[PDB]
mmCIF file of C-alpha atoms and ligand atoms in Angstrom:
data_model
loop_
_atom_site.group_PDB
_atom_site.id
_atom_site.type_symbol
_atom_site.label_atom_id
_atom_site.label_comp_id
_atom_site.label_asym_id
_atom_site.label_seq_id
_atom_site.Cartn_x
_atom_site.Cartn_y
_atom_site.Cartn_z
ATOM 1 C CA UNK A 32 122.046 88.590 118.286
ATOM 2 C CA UNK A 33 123.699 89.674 114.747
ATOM 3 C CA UNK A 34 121.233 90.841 111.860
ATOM 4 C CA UNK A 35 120.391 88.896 109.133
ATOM 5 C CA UNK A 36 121.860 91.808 106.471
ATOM 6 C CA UNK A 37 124.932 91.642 108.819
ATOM 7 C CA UNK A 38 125.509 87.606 107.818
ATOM 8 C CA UNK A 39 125.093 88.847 104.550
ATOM 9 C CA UNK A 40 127.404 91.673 104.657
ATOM 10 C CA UNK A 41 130.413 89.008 106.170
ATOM 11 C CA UNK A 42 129.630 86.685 103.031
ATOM 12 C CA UNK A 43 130.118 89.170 100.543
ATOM 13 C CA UNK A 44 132.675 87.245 98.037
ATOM 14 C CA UNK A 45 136.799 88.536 97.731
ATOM 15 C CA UNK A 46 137.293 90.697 94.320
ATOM 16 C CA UNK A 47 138.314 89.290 91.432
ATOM 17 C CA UNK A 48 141.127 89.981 88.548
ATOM 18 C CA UNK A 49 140.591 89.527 85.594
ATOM 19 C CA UNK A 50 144.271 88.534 84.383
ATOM 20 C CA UNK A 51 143.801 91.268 81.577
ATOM 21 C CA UNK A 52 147.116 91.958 79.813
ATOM 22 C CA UNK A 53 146.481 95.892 78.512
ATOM 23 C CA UNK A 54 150.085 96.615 76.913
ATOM 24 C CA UNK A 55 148.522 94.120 74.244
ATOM 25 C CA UNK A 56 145.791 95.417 72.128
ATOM 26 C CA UNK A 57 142.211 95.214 72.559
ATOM 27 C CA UNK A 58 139.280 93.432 70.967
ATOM 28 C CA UNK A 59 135.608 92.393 71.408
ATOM 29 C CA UNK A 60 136.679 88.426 70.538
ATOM 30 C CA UNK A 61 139.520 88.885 73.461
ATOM 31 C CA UNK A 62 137.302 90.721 75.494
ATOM 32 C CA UNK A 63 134.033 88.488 75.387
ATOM 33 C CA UNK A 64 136.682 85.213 76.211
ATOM 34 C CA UNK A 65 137.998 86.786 79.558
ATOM 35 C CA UNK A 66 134.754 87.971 80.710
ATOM 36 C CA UNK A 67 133.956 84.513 80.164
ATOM 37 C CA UNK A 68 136.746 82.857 82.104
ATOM 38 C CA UNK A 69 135.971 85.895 84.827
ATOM 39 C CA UNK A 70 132.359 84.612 85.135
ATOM 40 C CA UNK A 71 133.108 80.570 85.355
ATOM 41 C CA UNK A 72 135.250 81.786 88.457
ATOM 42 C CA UNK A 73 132.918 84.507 89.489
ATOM 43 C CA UNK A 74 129.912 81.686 89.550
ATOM 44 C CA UNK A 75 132.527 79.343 91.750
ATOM 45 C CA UNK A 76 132.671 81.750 94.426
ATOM 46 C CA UNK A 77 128.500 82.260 93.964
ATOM 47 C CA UNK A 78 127.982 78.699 94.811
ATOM 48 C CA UNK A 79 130.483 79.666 98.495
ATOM 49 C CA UNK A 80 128.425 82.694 98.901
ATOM 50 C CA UNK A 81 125.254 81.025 98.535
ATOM 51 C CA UNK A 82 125.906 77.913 100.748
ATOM 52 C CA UNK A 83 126.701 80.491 103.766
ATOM 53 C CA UNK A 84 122.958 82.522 103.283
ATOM 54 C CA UNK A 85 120.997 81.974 106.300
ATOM 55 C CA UNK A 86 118.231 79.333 105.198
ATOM 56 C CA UNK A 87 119.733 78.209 101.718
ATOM 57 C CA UNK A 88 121.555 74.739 102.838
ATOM 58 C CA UNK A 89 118.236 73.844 104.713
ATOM 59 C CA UNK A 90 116.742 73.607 101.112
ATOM 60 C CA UNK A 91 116.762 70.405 99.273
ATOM 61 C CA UNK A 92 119.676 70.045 96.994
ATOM 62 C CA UNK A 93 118.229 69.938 94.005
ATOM 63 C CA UNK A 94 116.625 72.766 95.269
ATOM 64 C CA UNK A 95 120.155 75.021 95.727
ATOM 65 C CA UNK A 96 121.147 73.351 92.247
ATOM 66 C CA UNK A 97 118.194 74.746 90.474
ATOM 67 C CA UNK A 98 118.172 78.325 91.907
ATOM 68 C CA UNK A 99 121.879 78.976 91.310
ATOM 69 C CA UNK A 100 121.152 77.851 88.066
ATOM 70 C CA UNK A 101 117.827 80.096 87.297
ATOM 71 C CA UNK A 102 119.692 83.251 88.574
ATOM 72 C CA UNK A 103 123.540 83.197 87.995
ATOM 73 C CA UNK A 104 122.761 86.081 85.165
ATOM 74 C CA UNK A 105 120.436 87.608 87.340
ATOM 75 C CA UNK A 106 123.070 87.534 90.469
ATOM 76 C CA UNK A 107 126.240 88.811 88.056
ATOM 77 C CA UNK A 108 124.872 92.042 86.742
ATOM 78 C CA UNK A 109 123.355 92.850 89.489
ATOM 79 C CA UNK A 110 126.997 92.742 91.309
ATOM 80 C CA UNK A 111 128.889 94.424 88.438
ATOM 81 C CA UNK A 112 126.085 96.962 88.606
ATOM 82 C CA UNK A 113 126.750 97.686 92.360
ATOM 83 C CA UNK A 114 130.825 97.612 91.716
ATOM 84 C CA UNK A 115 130.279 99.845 88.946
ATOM 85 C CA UNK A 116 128.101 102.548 90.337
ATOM 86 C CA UNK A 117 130.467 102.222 93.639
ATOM 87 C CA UNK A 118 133.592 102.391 91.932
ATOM 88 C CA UNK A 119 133.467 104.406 89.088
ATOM 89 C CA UNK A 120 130.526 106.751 87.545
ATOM 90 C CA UNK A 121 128.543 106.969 85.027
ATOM 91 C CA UNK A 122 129.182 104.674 81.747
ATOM 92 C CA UNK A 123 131.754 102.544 83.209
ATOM 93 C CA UNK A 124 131.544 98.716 83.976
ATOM 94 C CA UNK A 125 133.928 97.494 86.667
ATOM 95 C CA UNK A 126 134.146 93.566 85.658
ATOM 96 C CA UNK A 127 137.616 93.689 87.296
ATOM 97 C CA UNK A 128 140.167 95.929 88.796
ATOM 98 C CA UNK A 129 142.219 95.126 85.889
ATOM 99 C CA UNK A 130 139.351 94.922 83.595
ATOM 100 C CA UNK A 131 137.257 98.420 82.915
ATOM 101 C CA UNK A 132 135.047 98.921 80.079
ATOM 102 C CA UNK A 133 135.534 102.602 79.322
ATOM 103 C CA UNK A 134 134.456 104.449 76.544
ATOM 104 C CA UNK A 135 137.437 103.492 74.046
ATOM 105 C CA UNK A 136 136.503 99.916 74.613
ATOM 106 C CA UNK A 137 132.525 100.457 74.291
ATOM 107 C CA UNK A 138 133.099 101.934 70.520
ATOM 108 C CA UNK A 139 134.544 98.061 69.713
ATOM 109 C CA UNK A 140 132.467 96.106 67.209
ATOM 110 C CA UNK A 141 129.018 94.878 69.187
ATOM 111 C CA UNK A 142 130.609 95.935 72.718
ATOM 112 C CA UNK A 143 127.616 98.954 73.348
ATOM 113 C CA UNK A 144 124.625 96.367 72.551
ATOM 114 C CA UNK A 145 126.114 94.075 74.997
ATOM 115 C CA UNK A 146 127.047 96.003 77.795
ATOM 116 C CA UNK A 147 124.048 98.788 77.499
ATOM 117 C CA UNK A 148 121.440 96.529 79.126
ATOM 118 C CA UNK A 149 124.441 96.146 82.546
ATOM 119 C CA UNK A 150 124.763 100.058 81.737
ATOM 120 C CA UNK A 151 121.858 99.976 82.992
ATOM 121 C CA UNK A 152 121.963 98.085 86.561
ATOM 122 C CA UNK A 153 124.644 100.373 87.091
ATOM 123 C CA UNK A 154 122.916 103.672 86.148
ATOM 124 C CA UNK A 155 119.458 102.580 88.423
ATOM 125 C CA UNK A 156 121.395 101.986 91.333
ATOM 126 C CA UNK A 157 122.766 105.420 90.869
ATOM 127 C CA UNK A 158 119.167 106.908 90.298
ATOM 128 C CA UNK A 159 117.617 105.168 93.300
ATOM 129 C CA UNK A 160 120.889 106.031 95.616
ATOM 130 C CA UNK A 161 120.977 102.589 96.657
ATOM 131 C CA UNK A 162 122.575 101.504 100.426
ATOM 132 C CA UNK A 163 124.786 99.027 100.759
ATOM 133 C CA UNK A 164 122.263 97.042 103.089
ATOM 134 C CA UNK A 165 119.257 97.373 100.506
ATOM 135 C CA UNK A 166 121.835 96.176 97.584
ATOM 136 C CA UNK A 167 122.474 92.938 99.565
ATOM 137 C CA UNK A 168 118.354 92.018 100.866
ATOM 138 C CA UNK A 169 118.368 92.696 96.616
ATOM 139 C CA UNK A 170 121.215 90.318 95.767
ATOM 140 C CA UNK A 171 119.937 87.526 97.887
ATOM 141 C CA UNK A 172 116.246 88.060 96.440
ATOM 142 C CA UNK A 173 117.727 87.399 92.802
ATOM 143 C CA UNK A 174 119.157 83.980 94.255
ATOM 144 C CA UNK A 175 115.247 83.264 95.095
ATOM 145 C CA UNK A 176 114.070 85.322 91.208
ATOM 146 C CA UNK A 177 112.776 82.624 89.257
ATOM 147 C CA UNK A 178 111.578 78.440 90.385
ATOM 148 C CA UNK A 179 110.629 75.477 87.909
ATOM 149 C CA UNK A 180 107.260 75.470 86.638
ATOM 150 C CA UNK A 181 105.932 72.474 88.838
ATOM 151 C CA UNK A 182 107.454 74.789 92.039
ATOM 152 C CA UNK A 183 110.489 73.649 93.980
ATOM 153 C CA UNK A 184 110.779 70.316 96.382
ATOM 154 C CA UNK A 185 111.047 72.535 99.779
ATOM 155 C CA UNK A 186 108.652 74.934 98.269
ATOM 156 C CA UNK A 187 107.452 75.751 101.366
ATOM 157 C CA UNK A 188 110.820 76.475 103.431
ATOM 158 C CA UNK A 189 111.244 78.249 100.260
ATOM 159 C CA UNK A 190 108.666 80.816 99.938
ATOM 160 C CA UNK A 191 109.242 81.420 104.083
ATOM 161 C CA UNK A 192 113.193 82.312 102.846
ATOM 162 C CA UNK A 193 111.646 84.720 100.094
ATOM 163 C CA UNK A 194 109.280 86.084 102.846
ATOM 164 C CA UNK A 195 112.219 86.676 105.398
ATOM 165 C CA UNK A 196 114.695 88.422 103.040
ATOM 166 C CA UNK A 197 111.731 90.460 101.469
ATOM 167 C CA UNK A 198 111.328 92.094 105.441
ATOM 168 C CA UNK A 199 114.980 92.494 105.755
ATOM 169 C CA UNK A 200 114.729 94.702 102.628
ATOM 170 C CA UNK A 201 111.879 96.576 104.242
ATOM 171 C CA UNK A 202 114.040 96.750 107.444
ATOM 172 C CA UNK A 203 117.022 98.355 104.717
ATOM 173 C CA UNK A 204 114.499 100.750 103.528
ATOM 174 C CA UNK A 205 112.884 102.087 106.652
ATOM 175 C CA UNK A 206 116.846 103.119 107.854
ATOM 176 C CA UNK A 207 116.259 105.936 105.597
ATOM 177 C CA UNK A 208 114.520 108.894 107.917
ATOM 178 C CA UNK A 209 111.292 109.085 106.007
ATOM 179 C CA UNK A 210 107.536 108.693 105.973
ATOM 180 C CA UNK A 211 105.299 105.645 105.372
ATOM 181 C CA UNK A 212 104.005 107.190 102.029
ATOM 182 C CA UNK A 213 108.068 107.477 100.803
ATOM 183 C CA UNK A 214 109.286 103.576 102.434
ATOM 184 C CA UNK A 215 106.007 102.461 100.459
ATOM 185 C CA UNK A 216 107.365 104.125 97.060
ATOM 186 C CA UNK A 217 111.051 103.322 97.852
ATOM 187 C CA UNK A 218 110.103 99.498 98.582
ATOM 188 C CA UNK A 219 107.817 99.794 95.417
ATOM 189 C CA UNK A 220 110.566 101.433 93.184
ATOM 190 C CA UNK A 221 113.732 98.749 94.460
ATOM 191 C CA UNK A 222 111.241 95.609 93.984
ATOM 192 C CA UNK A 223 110.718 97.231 90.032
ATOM 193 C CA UNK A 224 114.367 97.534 89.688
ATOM 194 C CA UNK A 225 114.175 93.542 90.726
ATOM 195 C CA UNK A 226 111.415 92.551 88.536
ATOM 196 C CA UNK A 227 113.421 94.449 85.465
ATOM 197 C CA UNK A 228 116.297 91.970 85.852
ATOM 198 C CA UNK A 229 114.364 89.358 84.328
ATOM 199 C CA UNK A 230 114.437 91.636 81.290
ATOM 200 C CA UNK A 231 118.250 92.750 81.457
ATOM 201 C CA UNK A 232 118.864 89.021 82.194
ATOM 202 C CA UNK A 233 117.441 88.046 78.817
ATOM 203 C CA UNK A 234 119.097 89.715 76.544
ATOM 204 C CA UNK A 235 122.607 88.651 78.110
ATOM 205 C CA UNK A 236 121.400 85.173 77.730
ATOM 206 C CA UNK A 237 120.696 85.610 74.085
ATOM 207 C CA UNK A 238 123.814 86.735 73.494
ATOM 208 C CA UNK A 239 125.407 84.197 75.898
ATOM 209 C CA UNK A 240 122.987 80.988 74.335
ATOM 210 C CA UNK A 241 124.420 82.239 70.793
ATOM 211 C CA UNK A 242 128.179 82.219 71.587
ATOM 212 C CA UNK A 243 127.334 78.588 73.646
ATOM 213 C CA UNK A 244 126.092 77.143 70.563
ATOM 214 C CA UNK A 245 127.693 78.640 67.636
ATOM 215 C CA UNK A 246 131.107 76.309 67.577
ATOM 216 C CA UNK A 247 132.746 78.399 64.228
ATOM 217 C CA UNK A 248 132.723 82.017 66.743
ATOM 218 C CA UNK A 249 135.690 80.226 68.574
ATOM 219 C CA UNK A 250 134.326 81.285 71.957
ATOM 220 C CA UNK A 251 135.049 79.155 74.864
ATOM 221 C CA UNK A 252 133.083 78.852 78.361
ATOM 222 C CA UNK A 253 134.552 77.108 81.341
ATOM 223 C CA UNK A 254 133.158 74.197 82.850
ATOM 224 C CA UNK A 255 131.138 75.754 85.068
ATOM 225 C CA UNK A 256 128.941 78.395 82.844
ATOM 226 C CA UNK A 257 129.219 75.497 80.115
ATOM 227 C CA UNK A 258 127.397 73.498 82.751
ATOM 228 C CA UNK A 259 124.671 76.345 83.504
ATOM 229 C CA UNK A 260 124.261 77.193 79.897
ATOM 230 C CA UNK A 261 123.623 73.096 78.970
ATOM 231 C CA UNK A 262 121.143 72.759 81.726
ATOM 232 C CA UNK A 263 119.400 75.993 81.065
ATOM 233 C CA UNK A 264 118.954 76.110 77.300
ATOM 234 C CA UNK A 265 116.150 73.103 77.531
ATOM 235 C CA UNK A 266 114.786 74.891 80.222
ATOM 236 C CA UNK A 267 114.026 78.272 78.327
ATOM 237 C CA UNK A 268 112.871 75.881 75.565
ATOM 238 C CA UNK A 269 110.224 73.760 77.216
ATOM 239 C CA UNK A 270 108.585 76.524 79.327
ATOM 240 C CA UNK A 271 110.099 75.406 82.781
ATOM 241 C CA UNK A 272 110.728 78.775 84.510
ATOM 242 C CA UNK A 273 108.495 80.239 86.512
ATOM 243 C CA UNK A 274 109.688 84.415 87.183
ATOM 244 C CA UNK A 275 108.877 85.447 90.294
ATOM 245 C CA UNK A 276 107.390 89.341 90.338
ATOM 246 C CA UNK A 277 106.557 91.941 92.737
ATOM 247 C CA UNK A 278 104.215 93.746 90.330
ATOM 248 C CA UNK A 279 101.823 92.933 87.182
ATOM 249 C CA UNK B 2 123.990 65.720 84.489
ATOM 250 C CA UNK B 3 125.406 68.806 86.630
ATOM 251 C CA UNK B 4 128.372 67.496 87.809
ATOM 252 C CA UNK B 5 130.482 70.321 88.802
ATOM 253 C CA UNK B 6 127.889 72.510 90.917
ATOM 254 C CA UNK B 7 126.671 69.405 92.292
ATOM 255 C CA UNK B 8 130.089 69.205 93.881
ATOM 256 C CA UNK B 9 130.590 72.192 94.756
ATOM 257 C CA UNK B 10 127.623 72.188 97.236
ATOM 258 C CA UNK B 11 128.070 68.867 98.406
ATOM 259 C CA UNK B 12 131.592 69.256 99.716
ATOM 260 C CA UNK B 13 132.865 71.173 102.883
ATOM 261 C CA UNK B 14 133.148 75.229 101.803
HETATM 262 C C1 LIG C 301 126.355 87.176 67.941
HETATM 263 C C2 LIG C 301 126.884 88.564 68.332
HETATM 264 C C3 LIG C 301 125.811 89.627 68.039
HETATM 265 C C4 LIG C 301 125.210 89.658 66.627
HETATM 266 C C5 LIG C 301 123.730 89.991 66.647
HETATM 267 O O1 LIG C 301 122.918 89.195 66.193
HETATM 268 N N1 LIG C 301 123.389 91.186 67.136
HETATM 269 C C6 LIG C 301 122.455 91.359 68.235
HETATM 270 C C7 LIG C 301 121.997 92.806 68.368
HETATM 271 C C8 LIG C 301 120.885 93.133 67.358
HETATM 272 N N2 LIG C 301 121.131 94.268 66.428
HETATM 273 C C9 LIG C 301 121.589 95.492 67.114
HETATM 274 C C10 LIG C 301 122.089 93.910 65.365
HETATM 275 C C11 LIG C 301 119.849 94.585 65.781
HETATM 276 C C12 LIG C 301 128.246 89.000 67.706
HETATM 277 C C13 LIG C 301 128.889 90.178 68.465
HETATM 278 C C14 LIG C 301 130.410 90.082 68.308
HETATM 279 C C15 LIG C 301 130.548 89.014 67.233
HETATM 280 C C16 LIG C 301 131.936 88.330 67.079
HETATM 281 C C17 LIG C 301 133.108 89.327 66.943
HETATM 282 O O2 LIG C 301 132.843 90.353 65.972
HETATM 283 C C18 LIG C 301 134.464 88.669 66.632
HETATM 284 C C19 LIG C 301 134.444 87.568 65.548
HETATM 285 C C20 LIG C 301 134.643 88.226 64.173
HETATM 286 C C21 LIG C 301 134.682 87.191 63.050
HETATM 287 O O3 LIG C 301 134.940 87.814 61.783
HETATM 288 C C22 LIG C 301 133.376 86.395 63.037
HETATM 289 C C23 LIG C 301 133.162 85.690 64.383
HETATM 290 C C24 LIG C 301 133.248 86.573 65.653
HETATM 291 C C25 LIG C 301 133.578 85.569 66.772
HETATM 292 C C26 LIG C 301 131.897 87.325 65.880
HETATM 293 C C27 LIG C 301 130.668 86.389 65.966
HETATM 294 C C28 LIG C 301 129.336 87.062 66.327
HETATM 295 O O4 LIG C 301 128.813 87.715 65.161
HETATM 296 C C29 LIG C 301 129.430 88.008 67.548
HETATM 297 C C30 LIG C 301 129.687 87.221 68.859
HETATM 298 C C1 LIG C 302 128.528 85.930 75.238
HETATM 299 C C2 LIG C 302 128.017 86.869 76.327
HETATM 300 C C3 LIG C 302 129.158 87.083 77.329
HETATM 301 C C4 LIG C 302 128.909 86.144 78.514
HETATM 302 C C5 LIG C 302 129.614 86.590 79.810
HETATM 303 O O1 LIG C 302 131.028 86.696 79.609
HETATM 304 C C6 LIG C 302 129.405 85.507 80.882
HETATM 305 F F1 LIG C 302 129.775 84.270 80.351
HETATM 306 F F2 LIG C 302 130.210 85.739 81.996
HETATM 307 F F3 LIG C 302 128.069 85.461 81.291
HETATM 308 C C7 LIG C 302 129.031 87.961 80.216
HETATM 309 N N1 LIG C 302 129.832 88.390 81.370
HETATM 310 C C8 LIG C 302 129.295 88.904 82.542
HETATM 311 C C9 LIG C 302 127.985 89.404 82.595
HETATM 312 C C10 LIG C 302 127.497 89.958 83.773
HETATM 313 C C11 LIG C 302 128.312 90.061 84.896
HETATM 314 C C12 LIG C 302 129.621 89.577 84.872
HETATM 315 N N2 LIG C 302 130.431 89.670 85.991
HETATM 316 C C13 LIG C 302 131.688 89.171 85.983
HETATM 317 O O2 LIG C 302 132.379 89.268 86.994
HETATM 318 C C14 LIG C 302 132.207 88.533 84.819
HETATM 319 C C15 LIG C 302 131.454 88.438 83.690
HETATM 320 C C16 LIG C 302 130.127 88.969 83.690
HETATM 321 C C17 LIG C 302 129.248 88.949 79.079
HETATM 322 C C18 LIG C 302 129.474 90.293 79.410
HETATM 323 C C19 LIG C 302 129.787 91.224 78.431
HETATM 324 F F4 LIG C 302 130.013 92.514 78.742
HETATM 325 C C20 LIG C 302 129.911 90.825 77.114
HETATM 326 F F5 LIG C 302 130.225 91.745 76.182
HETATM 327 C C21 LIG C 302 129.706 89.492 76.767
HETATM 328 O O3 LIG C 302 129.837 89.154 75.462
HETATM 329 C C22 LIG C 302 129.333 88.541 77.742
#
């Protein structure tokens, strides 16, 4: 029979470019619009990903609409995290192959207090030596991060999911030679890291909310986070999200 | 409302 962290391993989605011409000069107006039209197509492939995890398309639709919706923050930084503490260390983020934020490109107008809070994703997953197999139990968890207020329709099939990929991070964990006293701490430490992506998640969507709204900035969103971004702003506004925690 | 993501779940891939 083939593990559950082994369907999520085959599922992982193809890399992206960017389509970032460098011989032309930089700028954080250029900069924030192709991350932009990276993420609409990043959040394409999320919805692929997501319809091939184990248990997901056995939830109600509006169900699979919702939690893609609550989380597609949540489930980006936490992948430019991993490719950036994979790819390239320390104060690097890997959006693209073709699209680096390196040190040059950090001192640009607002860049640092916008990419700081991804900075650190990145620098955790260094800290905490993440595995590949914990990073994806942690990926799938973020899907499964936050429900409405009034719970979810298959709320029940639901919180058996949650319970299922919480053990397969255990599972991750316990690969790592050590004693019940240090898979206790590592599963506490990796479910904080979680829980703080609510946090890293909110400034971005300040930020993001902002740009949405404010027509005269000239910043454009494709379809697809134009679509999150309208559905989630009433959402934030009326009090319907309920974050899911592993502590406090 | 939704249109987009609601297609992409609802057709094949
Ligand atoms: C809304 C955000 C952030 C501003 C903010 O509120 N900061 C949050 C951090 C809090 N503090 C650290 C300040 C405290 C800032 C960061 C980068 C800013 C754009 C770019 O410059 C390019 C361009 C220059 C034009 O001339 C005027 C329009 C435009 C589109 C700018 C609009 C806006 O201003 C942006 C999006
Ligand atoms: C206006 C804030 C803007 C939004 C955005 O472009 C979003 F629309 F994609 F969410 C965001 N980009 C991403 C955030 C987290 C992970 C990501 N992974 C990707 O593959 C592509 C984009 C991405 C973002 C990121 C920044 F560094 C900024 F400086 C921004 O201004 C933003």
């Amino acid at each position: 029979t083939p593990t559950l962290v082994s369907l999520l391993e085959v599922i992982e989605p193809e890399v992206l470019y960017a389509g970032y011409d460098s011989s032309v000069p930089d700028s954080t107006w250029r900069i924030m619009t192709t991350l932009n039209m990276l993420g609409g197509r990043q959040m394409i492939a999320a919805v692929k990903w997501a319809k091939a995890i184990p248990g997901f398309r056995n939830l109600h639709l509006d169900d699979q609409m919702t939690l893609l919706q609550y989380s597609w923050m949540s489930l980006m930084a936490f992948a430019l995290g991993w490719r950036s503490y994979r790819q390239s260390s320390a104060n690097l983020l890997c959006f693209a192959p073709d699209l680096i934020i390196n040190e040059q490109r950090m001192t640009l107008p607002d860049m640092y207090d916008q990419c700081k809070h991804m900075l650190y994703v990145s620098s955790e997953l260094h800290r905490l030596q993440v595995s590949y197999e914990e990073y994806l139990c942690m990926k799938t968890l973020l899907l499964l991060s936050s429900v409405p207020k009034d719970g979810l329709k298959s709320q029940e099939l639901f919180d058996e999911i949650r319970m299922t990929y919480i053990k397969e991070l255990g599972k991750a964990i316990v690969k790592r030679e050590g004693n019940s006293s240090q898979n206790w701490q590592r599963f506490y430490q990796l479910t904080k890291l979680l829980d703080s992506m609510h946090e890293v998640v909110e400034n971005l969507l300040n930020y993001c909310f902002q740009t949405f709204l404010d027509k005269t900035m000239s910043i454009e969103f494709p379809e697809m986070l134009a679509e999150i971004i309208t559905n989630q702003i009433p959402k934030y506004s009326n009090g319907n999200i309920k974050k899911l925690l592993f502590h406090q | 409302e939704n249109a987009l993501l609601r297609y992409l779940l609802d057709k094949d891939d």
